[PDB]
Amino acid sequence: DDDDKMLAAEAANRDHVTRCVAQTGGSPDLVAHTAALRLYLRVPHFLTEWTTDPDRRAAVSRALALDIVSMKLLDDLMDDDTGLDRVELACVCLRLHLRALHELESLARDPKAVTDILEQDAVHLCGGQIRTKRSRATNLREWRAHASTYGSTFLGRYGALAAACGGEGQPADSVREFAEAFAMTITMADDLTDYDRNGERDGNLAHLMRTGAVAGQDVVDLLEELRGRALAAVAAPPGAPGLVPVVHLYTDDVLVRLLPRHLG
């Protein structure tokens, strides 16, 4: 079945990454940390679901996993909250990033697309990240705007990328619309998921919900808007019907299990 395929890609992606981190000098502690980024290693699978060839699909999924983890380490490096070596973080981050550009470029119909896609909205992504951390959100409007950069544009670039290294007949705008909508659903999920790991403060949105600054129904509505946006994206021909239940799994998880944890 399909869950079988997702589980295998996740394990292939995980191994491609930890092997890479280990051979560049990352300690057992950082290797385990990259292996703990489950959704980050899984999402590249959903992102390459319009890729016909299984071999090309596995190569693109992992190349993308290499850069997603890389950017996620960059993030942990700017926050300094993981208690992981500052040096190993930077070093591994750059190493994984260079490996990803290399693999992705060798799979792209045209190597220049990789960097065109990366530069296209780099300012949007980076400046938004600066904006986001600079000022907390005070209501759903601001949260959502901050989230379309660290969440949506971030994932959206990888969608664009998968389309571009995913061979022929990949509806590029559609893979990206899925990427950005899905990214926001899981970004909320994480913001609302507390793990108790050290100096990890309440997730902004979760706080806004418990404070009352953000309306419960309003979150529900956004969730629904994001489910529709993604279902529409995967319905567009040629289609990726296989992502349909995935969109539902994640959107329904936040509605059923995460929201009740924050009704303030």
Ligand X SMILES: CCCCCCCCCO[C@@H]1O[C@H](CO)[C@@H](O)[C@H](O)[C@H]1O
Binding site for ligand X (CB under 6 A): 36-40, 43, 68, 71-72, 74-75, 90-91, 94, 125-126, 129, 150-151, 154-155, 183, 186-187, 190-191, 195
The answer to whether 138 and 167 are in contact (CB under 8 A) is: no
* Binding site partner of 69, from a second copy, ligand X, none, Cβ cut-off 5-8 A by kind: none
d(CA 106, CA 125): 25
Annotate 110-126 with b (16+ C-beta within 10 A) or e (fewer): eeebbeebbeebeeebe
Q: DSSP 3-state helix, strand, coil percentages of the chain (rounded to 5)?
A: 75, 0, 25
Does residue number 145 form part of the binding site for a second copy (CB under 8 A)?
no
First to last CA, the chain: 40
Q: Which is nearer to a second copy, 50 or 158 (CB)?
A: 158
* Binding site partner of 187, from a second copy, ligand X, none, Cβ cut-off 5-8 A by kind: ligand X
Q: How many residues bind a second copy (CB under 8 A)?
A: 45
Question: Which residues, 110 to 129, sit near a second copy by CB under 8 A?
Answer: 110-112, 114-116, 118-119, 122-123, 125-127, 129
Does residue number 201 form part of the binding site for a second copy (CB under 8 A)?
no
Whole-number CA gyration radius for the chain: 18
Q: Which is nearer to a second copy, 57 or 95 (CB)?
A: 95
Query: Which burial class, exposed, middle or buried, applies to 131 when counting CB atoms under 10 A from its CB (0-12, 13-18, 19+)?
Result: middle
- Binding flags for a second copy, 31-60, as an x/- string (CB under 8 A): ------------------------------
The separation between CA 58 and the C-alpha centre of its own chain, rounded to angstroms, equals 17
Residues that bind a second copy (CB under 8 A): 23-26, 71, 74-75, 77-80, 86-95, 98-99, 101-102, 105-106, 110-112, 114-116, 118-119, 122-123, 125-127, 129-131, 133-134
